[PDB]
Design a protein around this ligand. Structure first.
Ligand SMILES: N[C@@H](CCC(=O)O)C(=O)O
Ligand SMILES: N[C@@H](CCC(=O)O)C(=O)O
Ligand SMILES: N[C@@H](CCC(=O)O)C(=O)O
Lengths: 154, 153, 155
């Protein structure tokens, strides 16, 4: 059972890109923006875009395995003073595209954002074959981010 | 090795991943049983079984201490001109869970992504009873044109 | 062969959790920042236990020192006062970078029930493993009165 134990150890070992950008000043505009293209201009405070964020094709990529990928994006920042209705959205291309939206209104005063989801990657499936283009967009006004934490794990 | 066989089972994902393409599905402002709604459609890929029970119109789970991950991705629209709007999805359970994706005038897109998990216990409420999923559009009716639903455990 | 490695794999694939249900309660979530563990710990659970993931001495969520992700869910049945239009529930987790969850709604939505779910990619010997997380909850728009609460952390 030696080889099968090796395989199980691999199967139960988390693979991850956990990248933190601290003390930055990054504009997330109201026009759609490729998130990998935006981030790769910055120097991480810790972590690396590789292996989950491909800086050649500007996409999230996955391991070709029947193992689900968990994704989280935590953004510290602000919209302009007085911005009432506002949201942050993030779309992932795929066989069916997924659009995350975090909306708020005047009742909420914090502007910090937390988006989380998962992708049920199939071997030789769409994500494994093509990757995913991540398109971020701020709604209501432009957003200025000062800390960004992005995680993809599988 | 029985223990290695078991570990391979334990670490193998079980899933329903069902896609409905090119449809025009009304999600009304009144509560609607989601499994009942979907089973009137023909998947472009995947199968409702084993996680979506079309006899009792509910989500069902394996009787295992293994968490179920759920995602509903909808490409669709609220009517042109709709400002305040939301999509909600309730799961029955010992304590019912109500997911809400709300938005307002600031957001143009009407596409929806609801993701959550259920910490299934052996012999617990979900394993025993399953969960009725009740979907409802708020602010106006909604029309779904692509639906992707995933339950995995 | 490989007995210890198999033991370790069985441990790695065994979910550890706190799942606490508070049924038939009346809990005010005010408009000011409020420590969530402090708020819950005086309530007698209907089922489950706050320990080990919710530490009632330091009022923090705490984690096992393992390279294993923690999944978190908070399900709340309750209400804002009648007529409350714009409203949200906010939950912040301290961390190297704090995470701020918001569930907002407006006049279009009648239900006041709330579901917040997320995960934390715990690293062995990392920030959460060493410090835990202070969970701070706040109701926006008006005070919220919770009557059923289900809280889960698993790793
Ligand atoms: N199974 C799809 C992903 C489904 C999802 O969006 O989670 C793929 O491998 O591309
Ligand atoms: N432990 C509950 C589910 C808890 C949850 O909603 O995640 C059950 O087995 O029914
Ligand atoms: N890796 C971080 C947690 C990252 C997260 O917020 O998920 C820690 O161990 O504290």
């Amino acid at each position: 059972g030696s080889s099968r134990i090796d395989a199980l150890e691999y199967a139960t070992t988390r693979k991850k890109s956990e990248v933190v950008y601290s003390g930055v000043s990054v504009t997330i505009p109201t026009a759609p923006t490729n998130l990998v293209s935006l981030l790769k201009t910055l120097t991480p405070s810790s972590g690396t875009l590789a292996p989950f964020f491909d800086t050649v094709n500007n996409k999230m990529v996955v391991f070709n395995e029947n193992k689900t990928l968990f994704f989280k994006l935590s953004i510290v920042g602000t919209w302009p003073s007085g911005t009432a209705n506002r949201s942050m959205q993030l779309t992932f291309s795929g066989s069916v595209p997924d659009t995350l939206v975090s909306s708020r209104n005047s009742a909420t005063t914090t502007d910090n954002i937390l988006l989380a989801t998962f992708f049920s990657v199939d071997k030789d499936g769409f994500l494994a074959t093509n990757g995913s283009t991540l398109t971020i967009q701020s709604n209501g006004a432009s957003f200025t981010a000062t800390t960004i934490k992005i995680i993809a794990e599988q």
